[PDB]
Amino acid sequence: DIGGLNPCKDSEVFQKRLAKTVKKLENRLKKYEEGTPPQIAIQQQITQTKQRFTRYADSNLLCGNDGLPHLITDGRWSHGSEFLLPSILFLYISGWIGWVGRKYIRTVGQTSNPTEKEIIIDVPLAISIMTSGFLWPFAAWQEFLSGDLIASDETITTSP
Amino acid sequence: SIVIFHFSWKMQSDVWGTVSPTGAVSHITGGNFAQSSITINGWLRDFLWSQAAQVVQSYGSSLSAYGLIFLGAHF
Amino acid sequence: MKDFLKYLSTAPVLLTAWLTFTAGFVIEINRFYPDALTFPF
Amino acid sequence: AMLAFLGFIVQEFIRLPGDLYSEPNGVKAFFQVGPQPLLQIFLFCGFLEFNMHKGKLTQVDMFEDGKREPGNFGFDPLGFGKDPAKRERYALAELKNGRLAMIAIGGLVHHALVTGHATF
Amino acid sequence: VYKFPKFSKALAEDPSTRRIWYGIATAHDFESHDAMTESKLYQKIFASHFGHIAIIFLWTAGNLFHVAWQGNFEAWILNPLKVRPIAHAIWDPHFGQAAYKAFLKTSSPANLALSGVYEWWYTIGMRTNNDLYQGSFFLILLSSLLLFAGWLHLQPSFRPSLDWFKANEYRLNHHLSGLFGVSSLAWTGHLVHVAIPESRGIHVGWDNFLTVLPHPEGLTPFFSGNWKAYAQNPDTASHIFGSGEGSGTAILTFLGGFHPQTKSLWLTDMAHHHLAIAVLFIVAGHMYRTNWLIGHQMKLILEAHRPPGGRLGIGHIGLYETITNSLHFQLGLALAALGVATSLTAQHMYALPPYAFLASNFPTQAALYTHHQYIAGFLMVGAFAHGAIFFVRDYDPAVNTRNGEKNVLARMLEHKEAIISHLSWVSLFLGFHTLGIYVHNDVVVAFGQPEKQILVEPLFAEWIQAASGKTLYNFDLLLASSNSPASVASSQLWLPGWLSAINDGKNSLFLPIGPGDFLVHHAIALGLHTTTLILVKGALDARGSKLMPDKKDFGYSFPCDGPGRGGTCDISAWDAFYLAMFWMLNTIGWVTFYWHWKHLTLWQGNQVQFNESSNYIMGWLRDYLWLNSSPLINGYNPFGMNSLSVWAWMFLFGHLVWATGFMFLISWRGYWQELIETIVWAHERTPLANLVRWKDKPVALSIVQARLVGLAHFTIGYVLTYAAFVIASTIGKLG
Amino acid sequence: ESTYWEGKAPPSVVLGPFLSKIPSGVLGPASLVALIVGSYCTHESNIFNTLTVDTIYPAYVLGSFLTPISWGLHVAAWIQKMNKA
Amino acid sequence: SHTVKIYDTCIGCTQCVRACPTDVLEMVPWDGCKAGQIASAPRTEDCVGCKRCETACPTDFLSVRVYLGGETTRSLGLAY
Amino acid sequence: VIFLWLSGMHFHGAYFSNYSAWLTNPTSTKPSAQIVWPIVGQEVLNADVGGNFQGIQITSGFFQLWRAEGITSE
Ligand code: CLA
Ligand code: CLA
Ligand code: CLA
Ligand SMILES: CC(/C=C/C=C(C)/C=C/[C@@]12O[C@]1(C)C[C@@H](O)CC2(C)C)=C\C=C\C=C(C)\C=C\C=C(C)\C=C\[C@@]12O[C@]1(C)C[C@@H](O)CC2(C)C
Ligand SMILES: CC1=C(/C=C/C(C)=C/C=C/C(C)=C/C=C/C=C(C)/C=C/C=C(C)/C=C/C2=C(C)CCCC2(C)C)C(C)(C)CCC1
Ligand SMILES: CC1=C(C/C=C(\C)CCC[C@H](C)CCC[C@H](C)CCCC(C)C)C(=O)c2ccccc2C1=O
Is E107 left (phi over 0), alpha (psi -120 to 50) or beta? Predict the structure, then answer.
């Protein structure tokens, strides 16, 4: 399909990889005894390996000639769960972190001892700001509009 | 580092090993310390390159953590 | 317990607690839903 | 929590016509209904949150200017609460019922998880 | 203790050994010499250029002579795929009998030639050890010409003035038209006349060249306008190079792709290429104004280029006087262009091999690519260093400013913080995520579950490959489609040759790529961005910063500003070059590692080894370095030695020089001055040695000198060890 | 002289002492005609008819060179129009 | 010998003079500051370049500046 | 701190080790006193140290020291 890849559900090398891993795990399982915790752990390993391979097969995942899932990150929504949705999730979380950090910096920057409140965090104010970051996309595009997001010329510059 | 390298190679090459039932001594490396530890190329090849085989081929085995720590320590 | 709570509010203790909590919920997500290569949806 | 408890009791009893809306168990109904009906509820609740608090939705933004009685959305179409004498009693009753419903909502959800059938 | 640094009285009065060290390292900084004028500067640079070109020509003549005398060029002609070219003979008294026997080739011990000169000279039509001797003779004559010119232009009546040196329009017209176009025209003349018949078995030497027609019709189609006649009857697909079997009569053709036998570009293709380039450059050489009232005055062009809305300030108004009066701006521009050009040479001479039988010479392919990429990195770092030098000592803010507003160059120092911050952001972004994906693959593969690897298909780059005709990724885009207008347009000119070459698994033309290529390209991008960040930061911050708002008053290269203000180690612009040299070496190492591993897997056939193991770091360490280092380290063992013994010795030598660089970089001065003082006391207080005393007081190397020496050791060891590894690994793995 | 400019349009001297004296009413239509002719020549040498060794047609080639030129002619036409010419 | 320059931003706090290890700087009368004194560098032939003088300077970007130049047995700190 | 470290070592020997199995077969069982939780596929680190045990092989020689001390039980 895309880039010459093929779905992993029809990739023979993918099933060969699964079979080889299961065979190695079973051979390891053979050298232990009865329902002893080592055998239980190896059986859990086998079950998890089978579940992971089955989930990857039924996941709209494209496999190359090596039988490994390749990620299609050109931007198409068909393979949108590989990069685009995790990209949105990370952008949300990281914007949350950056927004709460910036808000805390600007909030304790207007107190008597701004530097003290950076090594000794005001946990009440920190908790107040941190749970308010869920609106960071909206807060950012409400502070940029008011001109409160960017400094203009009070920023320092070197000699040249 | 040089001291521990000397210890490791000398022990593996001229002390450690197995003894046959008839009394024949076979070492881990095979006595290569006497003739190949006298050149820097010998140290590079018959010790570093040769005994680093287990670290680089540890992936997928129970010693894979040693390969990961090898790479991380290089980093 | 007025200065002890202030000590717990210091940067190292707070960072250690936050990173321990963060690693904790990451590890537990990866335990309950392991081997997640793509988005579940 | 009060609305969700009433939702449990009605869902196990009444339910809606259709194959999707056929689970007497609320926990299993959360999965059978699919993501599409739930996401619409999520977006509608978000729209409500935005319009009821009029933009200021966060801990630092709300109550920044004051002039906002906690929990006072002005919602009173049926007119219960014109008399100030019973207003305090109604507020206390709402608070106590809300707390009881939080405890009961946890109880019902965890009963459905440990048994699986229903509340009855 | 005097008279050695004749150009510097300040150094000549130094009572220590620092005078000798600094005399070497400041000999070519003519602008800093005592009693210095601009006219003398340009004249000395001119003479030095002449001497340099003479050195280059002498080096080429020496290569030609040694191939003609001690090589096997004539034998290599008859069997280019089995005979290994010989560079020169060896006479070393330290050889044992075993070394003599191992290095013995034909009649004397000799070195295989990895420069690819055999294929290059064979392609351009050389078939005899007397043709090489003629070239060596002619090149020594040219070197004599250049040395005579260099001497002449220092004579009183023949020394050019500043106006002649700064005559931009004349030099551009002549350089472009004459140099580029006319040299391409002469090269097309040689290509046709000599090379084309020599590839077809007809010898065209310095005797029968006025009587052997390069084309049967003989200049009639050119004047008649029937230029298609020179393309009729090209070389067939069964043509044996150097022989008339299956040859043709055409001299200028479009064929595309490679010769079916030599797996290299068609000679008629390259002649046509050089003719087109010659015409284009001769035309473009008439642009600028000279004594005949027509042309361009580049001052006017630069001044008139200000966007009307206004986003580049006042435009390029002050750039003409800025560039003309600065030799470091021009040097930086030339070095950047040369670096890009040699990167282009490296990237195209492996994908599109231009010389016969060079594709099958794997060691020379690897050596050429590595050499040109290292030269490219050096040239780029030099360009940025000379830009920083221009900022320090040649930049004038008044010239680049008109009534408060700043021109296009002066505005680069206004948002310098923005530029540096965004370079830092890109570098951190790429490094964080490339290392994250690589370490994720490392950990996931190590735990025995390679299926959980993050492998991103390089769809953007595969899209480009499909656009050029590669039907491997099922894109059906531009030239992978037979119905697209791009394909119908050239279906009769060069697609059949181009498609037959791009869609071939044995070529290096557009090598198939996978997730490993994606990750390594992102690593390369990170290296480029970080080297650019260091160099740009040093260039822009050269004139000053917050830690040193008067850095321009201390020059381009100074040790520090002292331990005050928190510490000012490595604060000069020279130190930025010094730090960026490590990053250039690392980036070129990544590029060359990627190229060499990809081509080793391609040549050996186990391309699946790269496609699987290149996604994680341990894959690189185990399958490239550890795997291919086995033939090299066994160049000599306690049992014997091979012809690869010299490469193992060079490997160890490079490691040793690298670690001596580590000495000079980690340990700083001050620790070496007190030790030297102890040694001085020991020498002064010992009998039988008091009779001998130094003339220059022995002192420790200066901070900047120590940084330079450590960098030189680091770089020399780096280059030597990698050259030894790549050459020995290719030779010992691929026969 | 003084090709430097800061107003709405550059002075006519930047066009050279051959285009500085062409009326804009001449350059404009000439630029449009040159662009149309060059586009047609390009589309007749290629695109509509595939190129071949036997079909090069210096008219279409020389013509096609009017497309790059056209760009310059209409730029000069705008410069002349804004400079009251 | 190195070059030492004094700039009128001098506040005459004497910290440079009492930090010089080779007696290069001295305090001289002046009328450009409250203290009525300014640093001077009349013995730069003994300047070693250690830059202790400008490590003790409290003014914003320094009032004493040391420019390293030609080297001498005195400026190189050579006891031999 | 040192006493806490020693207590941890002895606790791992008591609870997460194959010391009892190693006592009965010192020459064929590899000493292991640290088992690894099964997360993110890291359970491969639990090696086949012998004695019906899975864990990380121990190179600190605590098993030999404990045997020399006469410790025969966990
Ligand atoms: C939490 C607040 C915060 C915010 C909003 C930013 C924002 C920014 N940083 Mg930054 N930075 C921060 C903390 C922060 N940084 C810290 C703590 C460090 C020290 C490690 C840095 C080091 C740093 C460098 C070296 C660079 C930036 C750059 C940038 C810019 C581009 C984004 C980037 O590259 O991220 C960079 C982010 C990191 C390197 C990781 C940050 C480390 C953690 C995640 C942040 C700290 C969280 C904090 C403890 C939360 C406490 C708040 C709570 C008490 C309420 C952007 C302006 C780049 C730039 O200039 O581009 C324009 C750049 O080159 N930053
Ligand atoms: C036709 C007349 C002519 C010719 C042939 C030359 C030739 C030369 N002059 Mg020269 N010069 C001329 C007229 C001429 N000049 C005039 C009229 C003036 C006065 C205005 C000068 C003033 C002058 C000075 C002041 C200097 C020279 C120098 C040089 C030499 C440059 C070094 C060299 O060997 O480069 C050889 C280069 C080539 C053979 C070609 C290089 C090929 C390039 C690198 C490939 C580019 C291809 C492509 C663009 C790559 C990019 C890919 C693309 C896709 C973008 C060269 C021999 C310099 C020198 O060394 O003096 C001895 C020097 O300092 N000249
Ligand atoms: C044609 C290109 C070109 C030209 C004309 C110049 C010209 C100049 N450069 Mg420059 N430079 C270039 C390329 C060029 N450079 C490149 C590519 C780089 C990046 C590496 C630099 C980096 C650079 C710096 C950092 C500096 C200069 C400086 C200078 C100026 C003085 C040079 C000097 O004193 O030499 C001195 C010459 C030496 C010290 C000789 C060094 C020889 C090295 C160590 C190699 C020798 C070892 C050899 C390989 C032995 C092999 C070992 C064996 C075992 C195998 C001069 C104007 C200096 C200056 O002040 O400019 C104003 C300065 O600070 N340049
Ligand atoms: C609400 C609650 C949990 C609700 C869970 C919900 C909706 C879960 C929904 C889901 O699961 C499903 C359906 C499907 C999943 O796949 C997805 C999600 C979406 C996750 C728990 C409450 C849990 C509530 C708890 C545990 C309350 C504990 C109260 C205590 C201990 C009180 C003690 C006292 O009251 C006494 C006894 C005497 C007093 O005088 C003093 C005090 C001390 C105050
Ligand atoms: C510091 C400084 C300096 C230097 C700088 C530098 C060194 C730079 C570099 C630069 C560079 C190094 C750049 C580069 C560039 C490149 C480019 C710009 C490219 C382009 C390309 C293109 C555009 C292409 C296109 C295409 C494609 C893609 C496809 C095919 C076809 C075509 C052609 C269309 C100086 C001295 C000046 C001055 C001072 C400052
Ligand atoms: C080893 C070392 C030294 C000591 C090394 C010195 C002094 C060089 C010793 C002389 C070398 C070996 C060259 C000797 C050459 C012969 C004496 C012949 C003379 C050649 C000259 C005439 C050019 C430093 O001085 C130093 C200074 C600053 C940072 C790091 C270091 C550092 O690492």
Answer: alpha
